[PDB]
């Protein structure tokens, strides 16, 4: 009455050579509690993923009808084996003889014409029915024997129906069911010659199996080994970046019929938006698209604190000092940039607009100024300059205006053409998220080891509400080890976030695979007091199903060795 390493199926149909692949979608953990019925007439249980197995000869249990609640409440798929005529109907309802009951609406007629132990594993994921077939000659009549029973798929008809039950068992028999539930875990399969498996290691049954799956080898030597214990209890995934808000004004930036000079660059503030970032990627005519702080692609994944826009016109190839560190005449007199800019820049040609064949003298730049400009500094002064005071009335001796106008014309070179540079200054200061990517969010699930994907904080853990010392203007928070400690929700209900996770990754001490079969654990940094409480309540990350505790000893750097006294 226990699944002794039963229910191993191929995760895909791609042929693989001799390697050690790690499977995640595989189900039916080894040594699981199977609800075998060794028999409103049937005993139809909930599906939740099942494992079909018939240990009776003469083909007693030959029909199973998947679907939903009976009595004509939802669509149900009929899989009946009658005289080698497998007709898969998915339209008959129930107000052997459960087919001709009602004929309201029928569609999708599928006809497939053509001791014993037949194993079947049924999977329903995103509306896809996966059916596998496996046979193994047995001789005992006590219970389910051991074995591997490599499964092979036979039918993969989705039907868009979430199966939840199974019925229509024959009569006039023994007659058993042997249906067992499955749990989502991780698996490590072996690929031998001729495309057969013949060996599988479920990384969820014992710490020794987890250690075997860690180093990716079917043999463990003596010593201490551990890799993050990240293949014990997986779960779903939560997301962020809630429903969209008013559109970002980034579109109206690249539409002004007129643009300022270099010394009088306008600073437009952008806040409380959800930037699409579609005008930056598409329309690939930006000849100087560069990013400095963030990656040029990872823009729809972050929530910037505050973004701006700096629009000015430069002359051709003179766009080489709008980068952090570059110096020159347009880097300390007209427009500056900090050493840590953390933003992108763009520049597109405007030869057919800001250029004439008779004089386009409308843009100027500052090239004579006392000292250098500070990061993000603007000066629109207009006065003759001399480093001795010297009000310098223009025509007196040698006074001239420290502003040289450009020479924009039509018949010129590439390096003398008006290039409008729009500088987007991104920020990640301590402030609520004012600009994010066009994504959707879901509900904040509590007390579940789901991976969290916040505005800019990713990872995994048990998201649980708590109480700490937070500030209204502060959105997220880090720990001493540069790890995300707490973060508020961008949508609403600003509360604390995931508490400290499991107390490190426990190591597995094994004195040798060929030596013995014992298993012992070694916790890196724990107190050896609340470990049993966290394990018995299924709240700890390395929580094995078949696991116990014999003795815990607490010393300086204890590392309670559970497994040997």
């Amino acid at each position, epitope marked *: 009455h226990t699944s002794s390493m039963r229910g191993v199926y191929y995760p895909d149909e791609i042929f693989r050579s001799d390697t050690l692949y790690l499977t995640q979608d595989l189900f039916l953990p080894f040594y699981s509690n199977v609800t075998g019925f060794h028999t409103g007439n049937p005993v139809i249980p909930f599906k939740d993923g099942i494992y079909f197995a018939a240990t009776e000869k003469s083909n007693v249990v030959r029909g199973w009808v998947f679907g939903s609640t009976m009595n004509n409440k939802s669509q149900s798929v009929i899989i009946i084996n009658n005289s080698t005529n497998v007709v898969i109907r998915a339209c008959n309802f129930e107000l052997h003889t459960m087919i001709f009951d009602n004929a309201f609406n029928c569609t999708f007629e599928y006809i497939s014409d053509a001791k014993h132990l037949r194993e079947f594993v049924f999977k329903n994921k995103d509306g896809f029915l996966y059916v596998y077939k496996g046979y193994q000659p047995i001789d005992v009549v006590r219970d389910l024997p051991s074995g591997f029973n490599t499964l092979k798929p036979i039918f993969k008809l989705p039907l868009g129906i979430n199966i939840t039950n199974f019925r229509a068992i024959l009569t006039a028999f023994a007659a058993a069911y042997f249906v067992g539930y499955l749990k989502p875990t991780t698996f490590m399969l072996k690929y031998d010659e001729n495309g057969t498996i013949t060996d599988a290691v479920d990384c969820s049954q014992n710490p020794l199996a987890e250690l075997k799956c860690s180093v990716k080898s079917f043999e463990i030597d003596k010593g201490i080994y551990q890799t*993050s214990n990240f293949r014990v209890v997986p779960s779903g995934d939560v997301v962020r970046f809630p429903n969209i808000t008013n559109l970002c004004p980034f579109g109206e930036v690249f539409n002004a019929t007129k643009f300022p000079s270099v010394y009088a660059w306008e600073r437009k503030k952008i806040s409380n938006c959800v930037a699409d970032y*579609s005008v930056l990627y598409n329309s690939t005519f930006f000849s100087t698209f*560069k990013c400095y702080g963030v990656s040029a692609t990872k823009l729809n994944d972050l929530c910037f604190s505050n973004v701006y826009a700096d629009s000015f016109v430069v002359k051709g190839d003179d766009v080489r000092q709008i980068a952090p560190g570059q110096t020159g005449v347009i880097a300390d007199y007209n427009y500056k940039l900090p050493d840590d800019f953390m933003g992108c820049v763009l520049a597109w040609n405007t030869r057919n607009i800001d250029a004439t064949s008779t004089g386009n003298y409308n843009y100027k730049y500052r090239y004579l100024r006392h000292g250098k400009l500070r990061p993000f500094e603007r000066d629109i002064s207009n006065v003759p300059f001399s480093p001795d005071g010297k009000p310098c009335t223009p025509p007196a001796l040698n006074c001239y205006w420290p502003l040289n106008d450009y020479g924009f014309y039509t018949t010129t070179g590439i390096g003398y053409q008006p290039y409008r540079v729009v500088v987007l200054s991104f920020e990640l200061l301590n402030a609520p998220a004012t600009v994010c990517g066009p994504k959707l969010s879901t509900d904040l699930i509590k007390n579940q080891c789901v991976n969290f994907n916040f505005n800019g*904080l*990713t990872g995994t853990g048990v998201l649980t509400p708590s109480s700490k010392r937070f500030q209204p203007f502060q959105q997220f928070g880090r720990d001493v080890s540069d790890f995300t400690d707490s973060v508020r929700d961008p949508k609403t209900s600003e509360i604390l976030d995931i508490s400290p996770c499991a107390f490190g990754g426990v190591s597995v001490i094994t004195p040798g695979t060929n030596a013995s079969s014992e298993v012992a654990v070694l916790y890196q940094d724990v107190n050896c007091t609340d470990v049993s409480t966290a394990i018995h309540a299924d709240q700890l990350t390395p929580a094995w199903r078949i696991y116990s505790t014999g003795n815990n000893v607490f010393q300086t750097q204890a590392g309670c060795l559970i497994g040997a006294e």
Partner: antibody
Amino acid sequence: VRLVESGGGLVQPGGSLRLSCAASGFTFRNYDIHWVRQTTGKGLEWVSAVGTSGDTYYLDSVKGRFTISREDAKKSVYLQMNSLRAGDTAMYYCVRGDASPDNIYYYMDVWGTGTRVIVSS
Amino acid sequence: DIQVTQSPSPLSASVGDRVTITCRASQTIGKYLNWYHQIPGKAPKLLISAASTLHSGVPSRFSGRGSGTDFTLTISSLQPEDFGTYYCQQSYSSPPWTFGQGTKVEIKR
């Protein structure tokens, strides 16, 4: 997580020759894919990359000549080389970019095996 | 651009494990720089992260430090299966993903 290359290179300078980069069981619908040019004794000079959106990046030198395209379901990325010159004979790789916290690094996570596109007689 | 210059001389690795792999650059960058490794014959691979996020695949013996503009690659006891050329790349200029030059590590006899 492994990428397998395909094809090679034999055409003369002045022709067209595309490449391909497959994928594996990893979720190849949100990560990035870039190219790498190793001339067997020179620098890894390639910056072209395509992201989740319609982002198409290229190099300043080879601009307007090469085009990039990717397919999510097919798990394949293509790179067509139009108007191929004689100074591109090298081994082309395929890399993937990813940032752990949000954006800081790319790490060039998983490489490939390589594809030699030589242009001579 | 962000001109990065590595060590211009290959470091012949003796029985010791004292390497001085430097990745100095023109401007200053906090952690926008990584380190790779390529055994001659195969494709390159990641060896050292941005000095504070070394993940699996590479043994924990390979350490890394860096701040400002002077980067140092501290490596623990060397192994014979960990030889080849180690490259470093800057992560500041996002479109121009320009790598370094290369530092070869050979055997001393």
